[PDB]
Design a protein that fits this description.
The chain has 357 residues and is of the alpha+beta class. 31% of the residues lie in helices and 32% in strands. Helix 2 packs antiparallel against helix 6. Bound molecules: the ligand CCC[C@@H](NC(=O)c1cccc2c1CC(=O)N2)[C@@H](O)c1cccc(F)c1C.
Length: 357
């Protein structure tokens, strides 16, 4: 069916998406609800009281309704699915915890992080800010075989604790077809901005429909690693309407539909990245205490004060009847979700507005 925590991850995806889209309506959006929520659920194991409750509530878990055991069990099961060989061929995810080597660390936290969340904790010398930044970036670069470079650009001089969360997905259509060369085609960013994109033209039976509720074309395509992308192409002037009207229930209904129709598609071959300061973005969702001097991280270190000084997310996606069917060109801004098929968990959510930006 679906993972217990999938509805929570869906609400977290919409909360974070709508925050980013409200900030700027001219900006690309690309993040992993799954990888950010996993990292902060893992971090919550080392926190207590208001610091702890703020993190899980900020991930859209109602702690009056869902027991904390079912939350961690949900994530462990989700990670079990994501760590299967078929998934691992397309999907790399990692969480690096970097802690000042002068700290006495609680063994229980280091056990739970490594055991339950398959995450890595390192001691680093934050006395040397430039070397610590290099060590963090080397760990991410090595984890992604050179794909993610110089992830952390700045560390505060008083940094004692940094968290880096990364996800790398190699996108390749599951279904083989009559492969042509891409052709360079216009992508209408806005009324006065056009950029060339490589466009794959396909005529076939697609899981595609027009939605009166979303005022959008809705296309579902399958990728290796048990992933389904839902692409929402809004009608002229309806992108904000589409963003406003999306719900988990609506997305579930699209994922359940297997009906196809004949369509001529123009599909841009787009690689996309998103980099986020999680202290900034999660702060706006109400996660603030863990990043403040007040932070209760007594689960990480018993003796000394501790706060999370730095939290960075990076998401990377790379691509490896005889009657006139509809012609649908993804040649203008579109919204998307990528779902993991077993759990129905939102691996990615975002919006392409400028393919070159
Ligand atoms: C509207 C389609 C965008 C999509 N394109 C393709 O998947 C594509 C296009 C041409 C050739 C080709 C592919 C896959 C393959 O194997 N060959 C992709 O760029 C994308 C954008 C944002 C989010 C996201 F999840 C994904 C998958």
């Amino acid at each position: 069916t679906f993972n217990k925590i999938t509805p929570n991850l869906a609400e977290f995806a919409f909360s974070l998406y709508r925050q980013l889209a409200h900030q700027s309506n001219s900006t690309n959006i690309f993040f992993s609800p799954v990888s950010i929520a996993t990292a902060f659920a893992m971090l919550s194991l080392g926190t207590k009281a208001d610091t702890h409750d703020e993190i899980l509530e900020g991930l859209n878990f109602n702690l009056t309704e869902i027991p904390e055991a079912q939350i961690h069990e949900g994530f462990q099961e989700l990670l079990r699915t994501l760590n299967q060989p078929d998934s691992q061929l397309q999907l790399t995810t990692g969480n690096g915890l970097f802690l000042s080597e002068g700290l006495k660390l609680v063994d229980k936290f280091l056990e739970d992080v490594k055991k339950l969340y398959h995450s890595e904790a390192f001691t680093v010398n934050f006395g040397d800010t430039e070397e610590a930044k290099k060590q963090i970036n080397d760990y991410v670069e090595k984890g992604t075989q050179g794909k993610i470079v110089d992830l952390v650009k700045e560390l505060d001089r008083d940094t004692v604790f940094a968290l880096v969360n990364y996800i790398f997905f190699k996108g390749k259509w599951e279904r083989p077809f009559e492969v042509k060369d891409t052709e360079e085609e216009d992508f209408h960013v806005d009324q006065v901005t056009t950029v060339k994109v490589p466009m794959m033209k396909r005529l076939g039976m697609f899981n595609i429909q027009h939605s009166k509720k979303l005022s959008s074309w809705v296309l579902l395509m399958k990728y290796l690693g048990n992933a389904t992308a839902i692409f929402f192409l809004p009608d002229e002037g309806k992108l904000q309407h589409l963003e406003n009207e999306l719900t988990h229930d609506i997305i579930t209904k699209f994922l359940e539909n297997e009906d196809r129709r004949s369509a001529s598609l123009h599909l841009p071959k787009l690689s996309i990245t998103g980099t986020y300061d999680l202290k900034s973005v999660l702060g706006q969702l109400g996660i603030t205490k863990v990043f403040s001097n007040g932070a209760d991280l007594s689960g990480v270190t018993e003796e000394a004060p501790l706060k999370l000084s730095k939290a960075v997310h990076k998401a990377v996606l790379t691509i490896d009847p005889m009657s006139i069917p509809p012609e649908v060109k993804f040649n203008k801004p579109f919204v998307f979700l990528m779902i993991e098929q077993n759990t129905k968990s939102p691996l990615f959510m975002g919006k392409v507005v400028n393919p070159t930006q």
